[PDB]
């Protein structure tokens, strides 16, 4: 399993700096070039720089030359990218990727999952979690719909699962929406067979790491 | 840095169709690379060195080209192909990526299963009332969700959200939640959601009477 592990998210204050990790395993870290790529909806995938862990040698894109500093640790096999004095324009997803085979030509054949960075001065706010109860309706139905309204939290992201990850089929967790209040809102629904509403218990698990908040809500069916 | 321009921006393809997407470079490059990126995930190596397929990439995919003109082509479009495909070059430092061509599956018509959710008891015990209308597994994306309060059409006080196209069935899901104060929420009886979509025979309405059940 050749793999590159990066943390999921980081919240940075505008003006501050952040050092991102990218641990590698399944191959010898010192014989391959590690690359970092930036991604935004507006400016696309941008190459930042690269480092060769067996040397310490580094290569930069002029654009991020004064913004990024690349380092590598041999013993822990980790690559690092430090972003200095972050501004709103630095909010984006950051990937680390190994390159290989100079022959034909190089190849980004191993990427990290990417660490999403949000730069904001706003304080962290935990999510309020409310149940979206499946009524009995006028419609008899064969399948009912269950949900969880995770609202008024900051910043992204919030992880939502069902029954500790046991229920995955038929789940739709919607993209967050920044409300007028500057906080995010989200909804997570699942369809399930109608007859199971009395036998099965459905719990939605909300995890909002950036505020150390974990909430498990029971969505109670309503006899309508 | 060399500029890679991709086209088309969006490529609509029916399951089974044979499509191709192009990539042009500001100046000649020796090889071009292609990556597939589904939302929320890291871009996956798809084609390396102009024509080679990466591990686990089906024969339907292929790529060719030379100098400043390259292309990726799918012989038989399938559902799991929905995604943005990105162009990439190593000939010049700094290496650059293209803007990407988004591929979406034009599958057959599918009506949404509509459900309406009244605000929770805990929520009003905080002063705010959110009413959610759910549109499940539908296609095409164009759907009209209209909130009715006491038989009167509402506007501007509700936000919508859509999921990305599902990789197995190629449909979308949409949530439209109306948010209003407890005080105003208590001024009306019937809260409804009206939905019109190509798929259903006639515009459906799912509603409920405030505090009845």
């Amino acid at each position: 399993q050749v793999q590159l592990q990066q943390p999921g998210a980081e919240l940075v204050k505008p003006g501050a700096s952040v050092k991102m990790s990218c641990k590698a395993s399944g191959y010898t870290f010192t014989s391959y070039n590690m690359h970092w790529v930036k991604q935004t909806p507006g400016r696309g995938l941008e190459w930042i720089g690269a480092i060769y862990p067996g040397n310490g040698d580094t290569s930069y894109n002029q654009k991020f030359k004064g913004k990024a500093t690349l380092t590598a640790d041999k013993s822990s096999s980790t690559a690092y990218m430090q972003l200095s004095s972050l501004t709103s324009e630095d909010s984006a997803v950051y990937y680390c990727a190994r390159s290989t085979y100079y022959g034909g030509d190089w190849y980004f054949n191993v990427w990290g999952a990417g660490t999403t960075v949000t730069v904001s001065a706003a304080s962290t706010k935990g999510p309020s979690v409310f149940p979206l109860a499946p009524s009995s309706k006028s419609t008899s139905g064969g399948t009912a719909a269950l949900g969880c309204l995770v609202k008024d939290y900051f910043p992204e992201p919030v992880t939502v699962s069902w029954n500790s990850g046991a229920l995955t089929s038929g789940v739709h967790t919607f993209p967050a929406v920044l409300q007028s209040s500057g906080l995010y809102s989200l909804s997570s629904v699942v369809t399930v067979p109608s007859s199971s509403l009395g036998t099965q218990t459905y719990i939605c698990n909300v995890n909002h790491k950036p505020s150390n908040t974990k909430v498990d809500k029971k969505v109670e069916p309503k006899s309508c | 840095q060399i500029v890679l321009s991709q086209s088309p921006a969006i490529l609509s393809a029916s399951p089974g169709e044979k499509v191709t997407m192009t990539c042009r470079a500001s100046s000649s490059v020796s090889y071009i690379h292609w990556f597939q990126q589904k939302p929320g995930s890291s871009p996956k190596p798809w084609i390396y060195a102009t024509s080679n397929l990466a591990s686990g990439v089906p024969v339907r995919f292929s790529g060719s080209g030379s100098g400043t003109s390259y292309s990726l082509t799918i012989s038989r479009v399938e559902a799991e192909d929905a995604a943005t495909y990105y162009c990439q070059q190593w000939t010049s430092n700094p290496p650059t990526f293209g803007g990407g061509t988004k591929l979406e599956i034009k599958r057959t018509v599918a009506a949404p299963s509509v459900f309406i959710f009244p605000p929770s008891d805990e929520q009003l015990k905080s002063g705010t009332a959110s009413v959610v209308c759910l549109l499940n597994n539908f296609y095409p994306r164009e759907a009209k969700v209209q909130w009715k309060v006491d038989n009167a059409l509402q506007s501007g006080n509700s936000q919508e959200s859509v999921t990305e196209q599902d990789s197995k069935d190629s449909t979308y899901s949409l949530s439209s939640t109306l948010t209003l104060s407890k005080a105003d929420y208590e001024k009306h009886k019937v809260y409804a959601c009206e939905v019109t979509h190509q798929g259903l025979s006639s515009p459906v309405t799912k509603s409920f009477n405030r505090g009845e059940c």
Binding site: Y52, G54, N55, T58 | -
Partner: peptide, 20 residues
Amino acid sequence: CEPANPSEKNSPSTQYCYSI
């Protein structure tokens, strides 16, 4: 002449490249 991949910095081709 500058390589995107740092592991090239000391290669025969980059050194030749600098020999403009």
